[PDB]
Amino acid sequence: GIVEQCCTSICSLYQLENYCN
Amino acid sequence: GIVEQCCTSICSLYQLENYCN
Amino acid sequence: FVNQHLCGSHLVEALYLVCGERGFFAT
Amino acid sequence: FVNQHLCGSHLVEALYLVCGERGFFAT
């Protein structure tokens, strides 16, 4: 999920954005 | 500049982006 | 250098910023 | 709630994230 992708690892803008809405 | 716009105040994505490159 | 992880409350802010009008869970 | 200001080192990270390929001063 977002934590694995964006916190444990480093995520891009585009990846981050599929977690909007 | 960016500090006034994004730190002292709250900036949008679009505003932030004119500080790229 | 700087930390490139977005955790917890910084994650919330990054979402606020990038999601804009259409919002995000769990605001 | 959460802090919506992007200062200093959080500002650097926000730029890293949003600027992507074309970079930013002063990386």
PDB file of C-alpha atoms in Angstrom:
ATOM      1  CA  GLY A   1       0.000   0.000   0.000  1.00  0.00           C
ATOM      2  CA  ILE A   2       1.017   3.629   0.325  1.00  0.00           C
ATOM      3  CA  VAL A   3       3.145   3.014   3.456  1.00  0.00           C
ATOM      4  CA  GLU A   4       5.255   0.381   1.842  1.00  0.00           C
ATOM      5  CA  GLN A   5       5.560   2.361  -1.341  1.00  0.00           C
ATOM      6  CA  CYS A   6       6.017   5.870   0.011  1.00  0.00           C
ATOM      7  CA  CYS A   7       7.315   5.526   3.594  1.00  0.00           C
ATOM      8  CA  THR A   8       9.380   2.323   3.835  1.00  0.00           C
ATOM      9  CA  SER A   9      10.557   2.972   0.287  1.00  0.00           C
ATOM     10  CA  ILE A  10      10.749   6.078  -1.893  1.00  0.00           C
ATOM     11  CA  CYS A  11       7.786   6.792  -4.251  1.00  0.00           C
ATOM     12  CA  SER A  12       7.357   9.031  -7.240  1.00  0.00           C
ATOM     13  CA  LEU A  13       4.734  11.716  -7.847  1.00  0.00           C
ATOM     14  CA  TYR A  14       2.924   9.485 -10.188  1.00  0.00           C
ATOM     15  CA  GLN A  15       2.778   6.634  -7.645  1.00  0.00           C
ATOM     16  CA  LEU A  16       1.670   8.953  -4.860  1.00  0.00           C
ATOM     17  CA  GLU A  17      -1.106  10.220  -7.095  1.00  0.00           C
ATOM     18  CA  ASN A  18      -2.837   6.918  -7.507  1.00  0.00           C
ATOM     19  CA  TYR A  19      -3.501   7.209  -3.791  1.00  0.00           C
ATOM     20  CA  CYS A  20      -5.564  10.371  -4.264  1.00  0.00           C
ATOM     21  CA  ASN A  21      -9.359  10.071  -4.252  1.00  0.00           C
TER      22      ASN A  21
ATOM     23  CA  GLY B   1      10.001  33.890  -3.098  1.00  0.00           C
ATOM     24  CA  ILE B   2       9.401  30.240  -2.305  1.00  0.00           C
ATOM     25  CA  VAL B   3       9.850  30.727   1.472  1.00  0.00           C
ATOM     26  CA  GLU B   4       7.231  33.384   1.721  1.00  0.00           C
ATOM     27  CA  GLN B   5       4.892  31.507  -0.547  1.00  0.00           C
ATOM     28  CA  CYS B   6       5.389  27.950   0.658  1.00  0.00           C
ATOM     29  CA  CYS B   7       6.759  28.160   4.224  1.00  0.00           C
ATOM     30  CA  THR B   8       5.395  31.328   5.864  1.00  0.00           C
ATOM     31  CA  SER B   9       2.174  30.782   3.934  1.00  0.00           C
ATOM     32  CA  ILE B  10       0.564  27.746   2.312  1.00  0.00           C
ATOM     33  CA  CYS B  11       1.250  27.146  -1.432  1.00  0.00           C
ATOM     34  CA  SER B  12      -0.410  25.012  -4.044  1.00  0.00           C
ATOM     35  CA  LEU B  13       1.142  22.380  -6.308  1.00  0.00           C
ATOM     36  CA  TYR B  14       1.004  24.709  -9.187  1.00  0.00           C
ATOM     37  CA  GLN B  15       2.814  27.477  -7.269  1.00  0.00           C
ATOM     38  CA  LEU B  16       5.447  25.082  -5.968  1.00  0.00           C
ATOM     39  CA  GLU B  17       6.066  23.923  -9.515  1.00  0.00           C
ATOM     40  CA  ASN B  18       7.144  27.258 -10.851  1.00  0.00           C
ATOM     41  CA  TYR B  19      10.076  26.853  -8.489  1.00  0.00           C
ATOM     42  CA  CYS B  20      11.286  23.733 -10.301  1.00  0.00           C
ATOM     43  CA  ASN B  21      14.166  24.079 -12.768  1.00  0.00           C
TER      44      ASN B  21
ATOM     45  CA  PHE C   1      21.264  15.013   2.484  1.00  0.00           C
ATOM     46  CA  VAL C   2      17.428  15.192   2.961  1.00  0.00           C
ATOM     47  CA  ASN C   3      15.022  12.405   3.835  1.00  0.00           C
ATOM     48  CA  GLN C   4      12.985  11.249   0.801  1.00  0.00           C
ATOM     49  CA  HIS C   5      10.589   9.078   2.733  1.00  0.00           C
ATOM     50  CA  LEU C   6       7.069  10.401   3.317  1.00  0.00           C
ATOM     51  CA  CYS C   7       5.808   8.952   6.521  1.00  0.00           C
ATOM     52  CA  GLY C   8       2.795   9.547   8.686  1.00  0.00           C
ATOM     53  CA  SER C   9       2.051  13.222   8.993  1.00  0.00           C
ATOM     54  CA  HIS C  10       4.433  14.171   6.114  1.00  0.00           C
ATOM     55  CA  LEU C  11       2.590  11.656   4.024  1.00  0.00           C
ATOM     56  CA  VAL C  12      -0.675  13.480   4.791  1.00  0.00           C
ATOM     57  CA  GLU C  13       0.798  16.759   3.750  1.00  0.00           C
ATOM     58  CA  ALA C  14       2.199  15.369   0.496  1.00  0.00           C
ATOM     59  CA  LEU C  15      -1.208  14.106  -0.346  1.00  0.00           C
ATOM     60  CA  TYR C  16      -2.952  17.397   0.565  1.00  0.00           C
ATOM     61  CA  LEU C  17      -0.537  19.056  -1.871  1.00  0.00           C
ATOM     62  CA  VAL C  18      -0.718  16.670  -4.813  1.00  0.00           C
ATOM     63  CA  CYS C  19      -4.309  15.565  -4.612  1.00  0.00           C
ATOM     64  CA  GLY C  20      -5.810  19.058  -4.565  1.00  0.00           C
ATOM     65  CA  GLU C  21      -9.479  19.406  -5.409  1.00  0.00           C
ATOM     66  CA  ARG C  22     -10.465  15.794  -5.641  1.00  0.00           C
ATOM     67  CA  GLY C  23      -9.216  14.944  -2.133  1.00  0.00           C
ATOM     68  CA  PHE C  24      -7.872  11.798  -0.386  1.00  0.00           C
ATOM     69  CA  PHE C  25      -8.467   9.130   2.311  1.00  0.00           C
ATOM     70  CA  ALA C  26      -8.597   9.776   5.166  1.00  0.00           C
ATOM     71  CA  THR C  27      -8.182  13.612   5.150  1.00  0.00           C
TER      72      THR C  27
ATOM     73  CA  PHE D   1      -4.625  18.545  12.210  1.00  0.00           C
ATOM     74  CA  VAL D   2      -1.416  18.397  10.052  1.00  0.00           C
ATOM     75  CA  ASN D   3       1.008  21.183   9.227  1.00  0.00           C
ATOM     76  CA  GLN D   4       0.575  22.463   5.641  1.00  0.00           C
ATOM     77  CA  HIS D   5       3.677  24.598   5.602  1.00  0.00           C
ATOM     78  CA  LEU D   6       6.703  23.301   3.695  1.00  0.00           C
ATOM     79  CA  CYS D   7       9.772  24.658   5.335  1.00  0.00           C
ATOM     80  CA  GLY D   8      13.459  24.030   4.978  1.00  0.00           C
ATOM     81  CA  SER D   9      14.177  20.356   4.602  1.00  0.00           C
ATOM     82  CA  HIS D  10      10.481  19.473   3.957  1.00  0.00           C
ATOM     83  CA  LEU D  11      10.536  22.077   1.254  1.00  0.00           C
ATOM     84  CA  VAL D  12      13.483  20.270  -0.364  1.00  0.00           C
ATOM     85  CA  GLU D  13      11.648  17.008  -0.293  1.00  0.00           C
ATOM     86  CA  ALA D  14       8.476  18.488  -1.787  1.00  0.00           C
ATOM     87  CA  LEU D  15      10.514  19.819  -4.613  1.00  0.00           C
ATOM     88  CA  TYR D  16      12.389  16.521  -5.175  1.00  0.00           C
ATOM     89  CA  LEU D  17       8.948  14.914  -5.487  1.00  0.00           C
ATOM     90  CA  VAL D  18       7.188  17.397  -7.749  1.00  0.00           C
ATOM     91  CA  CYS D  19      10.047  18.539  -9.912  1.00  0.00           C
ATOM     92  CA  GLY D  20      11.169  15.065 -10.974  1.00  0.00           C
ATOM     93  CA  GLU D  21      13.385  14.790 -14.026  1.00  0.00           C
ATOM     94  CA  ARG D  22      14.022  18.419 -14.728  1.00  0.00           C
ATOM     95  CA  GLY D  23      15.386  19.138 -11.234  1.00  0.00           C
ATOM     96  CA  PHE D  24      15.552  22.209  -8.931  1.00  0.00           C
ATOM     97  CA  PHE D  25      17.801  24.794  -7.196  1.00  0.00           C
ATOM     98  CA  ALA D  26      19.760  24.056  -5.147  1.00  0.00           C
ATOM     99  CA  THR D  27      19.390  20.217  -5.014  1.00  0.00           C
TER     100      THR D  27
END
